[PDB]
Amino acid sequence: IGKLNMILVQILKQEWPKHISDIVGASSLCQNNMVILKLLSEEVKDSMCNEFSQIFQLCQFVMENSQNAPLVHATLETLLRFLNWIPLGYIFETKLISTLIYKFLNVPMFRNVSLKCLTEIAGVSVSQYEEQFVTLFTLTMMQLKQMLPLNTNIRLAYSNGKDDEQNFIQNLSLFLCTFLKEHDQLIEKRLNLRETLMEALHYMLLVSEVEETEIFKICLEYWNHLAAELYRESPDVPPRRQLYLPMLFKVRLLMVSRMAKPEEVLVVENDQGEVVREFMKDTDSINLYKNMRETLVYLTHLDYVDTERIMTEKLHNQVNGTEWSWKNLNTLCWAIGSISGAMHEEDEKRFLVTVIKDLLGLCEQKRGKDNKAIIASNIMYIVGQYPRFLRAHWKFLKTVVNKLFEFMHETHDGVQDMACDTFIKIAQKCRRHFVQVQVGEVMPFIDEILNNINTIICDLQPQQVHTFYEAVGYMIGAQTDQTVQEHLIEKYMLLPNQVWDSIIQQATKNVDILKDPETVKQLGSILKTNVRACKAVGHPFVIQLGRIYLDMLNVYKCLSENISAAIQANGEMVTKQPLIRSMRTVKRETLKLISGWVSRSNDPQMVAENFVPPLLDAVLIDYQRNVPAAREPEVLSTMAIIVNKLGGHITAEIPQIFDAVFECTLNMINKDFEEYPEHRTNFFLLLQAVNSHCFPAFLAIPPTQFKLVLDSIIWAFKHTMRNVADTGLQILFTLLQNVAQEEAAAQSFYQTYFCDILQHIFSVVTDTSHTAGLTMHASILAYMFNLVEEGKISTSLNPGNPVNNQIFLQEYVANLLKSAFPHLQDAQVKLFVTGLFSLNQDIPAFKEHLRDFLVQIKEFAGEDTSDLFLEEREIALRQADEEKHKRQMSVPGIFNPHEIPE
């Protein structure tokens, strides 16, 4: 009856660790006891682990003397669960390995469970018990060779085998992988065990051929581990490498054959037999590609010549049609592109010359349209990942760019997108080579591209047009000479400028044209193109922005008027219409363009003098008057960026910005979280920017608005979600630091808000709802305690009567703690508060003392304290990730050339 099992599980859930005794009474209920132990193991450091000796003894006794196969099986799983907790002496001394490796591992009924148990034992890493580990692997290999001989075709067996056989293959792969990852070096030192190690490697190779993804992942883990270990030994032949040389070439050949699809490839063959664009993706694919690239890079570093020979031979076979196939070409080209940094430059020159020549020759050979789509994708993937080769050879750069322009006219879904992406990759990495007169050219290549820009882009859709314009913009940013850079920019934005001028000329005589959907779409596209061009070029783009500034804001105002009129005359439902969304998109792109240029600018005086006033006039009032659904969140982000950049030059306009934007947005955020997420983020970014750079503004706004600001900050760090709470802590700490630098303002602020902030912070801390930010709470509390202790406050906090601030604040904190935790005794709280004050000058000690207090309170309350140490665990994880990243950065080729800073 499962009801009894569920009742037992519930009883175990009732803090069993705090309070195996049942199985001590074990005597056909033995299988029931085993199932109960399995459930307990699922429910579950050193939780009286010595008591697990009872479980092991029962398991041994049942295993040795019981003939009931189901009972033995259930005991086998029960033992499998507890091998990680039973003391190592029992497993490594009580004849455990021998009994199941002999009696059960050969029996088909227990083969899977027995192998799984052996896998768990092999995973235990211990300095001693070396002889036991050696016996385990030497004995297991011989036993499994009898049933699964090395000559068996594991690929076919798994393909046609039943579930049991597939499970056995998976278990064998896991066992070999884990043991070798843990104890391979022990076997290598035994001279007589060379053949057994060779047989294990052979087994790993054969299993790798299995098509199923999980088995290949298991094998790839071990291959990556081995490749990493060999490479780190020595980036004569070293000892360990000399032992693995015969098998390395087979592993390399297998790895090249089965390479996974990179993310940069947007066109993939569909299993129906046709080539279609990529429309499905899985997080597992990225991890698989990362692991395969890492392993292949390590193997390439171990031997350049073999890798080059293998790839050249495969490519040559592809060219002559001996083994022509889409899958083979795809895998080979992905492998070639995935080692883009491993080889030295000198050898990379030859390899890439041959590869590019062969691929270009092959492109003109095949005739099918689908064939050119597959071939073209590989061509534009290889070249995209080898900017170093292109920068050195002008002819190949010219040829590849021309070929990309040719592919831009292909009438296929993914080829055009890949061509634009690869053009961005090439231009962004080879800037200076386009704006210079090369050896064999009469004028810079940028001039050729610009003069024929109309013909190149005729077949591209708007997104691809924007991508191409960004790519070309990256090329103009490298023209150092401003006198020529301005001419390049003027010729660069000629077509969008013509369309914009035509639209504005039409509007000037009949404003109704702005309501035509086609005109709105055209304006949106032009604004998107300008945004991308500004993102690429950078500061020198001001010439275009200054050209289209006033007209852009006039269009913004007209669109705002039209949308407001529509919403007013037909309600808030109209915001869902297509035309209204297009108009809002136009407004959004205007704001994004302004924000981008301002963030890239470096002349605050000119920006404040020329650009800010019209923007404020056009934007501020419209945001205030619009209904909550029609308010654009990008206004807050733009204002935050302008405040961050201009700093003191805009502090005089902060009162206007808050009067128009502040209170309206606050009422929109606090009522309910999910209503307006983006508005919240932008609003807090703007508030943080103002607090950091233009603090004196807070003294200019009326005191009621400052009260609202403080209420918003308080609501920020009392929120449930973490990130908004962290932002609130940061803003509050910065505000406390800033206010202390002004004499009268400091006294007024302390007298008005000092106690409330302490009360709120203590309420947050005691409730233990934001343990992630305990460090910030400690920092703020220490800061305020230092302020009071040093006498920086010249007026009594208590308004009833003058009194020393120290005594009053200590009593106040004691009262706060007593109310939060009524069971506390007076002396305990008094001592805690007395000790806390003395540590206000040492933030780590303050934090540790506060955490100790909370820990003891929780332990008395009987609540888990794990969450109270979240910061340390997060720091440990971050440090581990940083160390892993640092280690990889030292190995060329693991990171794409587009990921390494340059």
Swiss-Prot record:
GO term, biological process aspect, one: response to xenobiotic stimulus
Annotated region described as Necessary for HTLV-1 Rex-mediated mRNA export, given as residue ranges: 1-514
SMART domains assigned to the protein according to its UniProt record, in alphabetical order: CRM1_C, IBN_N
Phenotype for M247V: Does not abolish interaction with Rex and RANBP3, and Rex-mediated mRNA export
Positions of HEAT repeats: 67-90, 91-127, 204-307, 350-388, 395-432, 437-474, 610-648, 720-751, 752-789, 837-874
Modified positions (N6-acetyllysine) in chain numbering: K281, K528
A GO term, aspect molecular function: protein domain specific binding
Modified residues (Phosphotyrosine): Y289
Protein name: Exportin-1
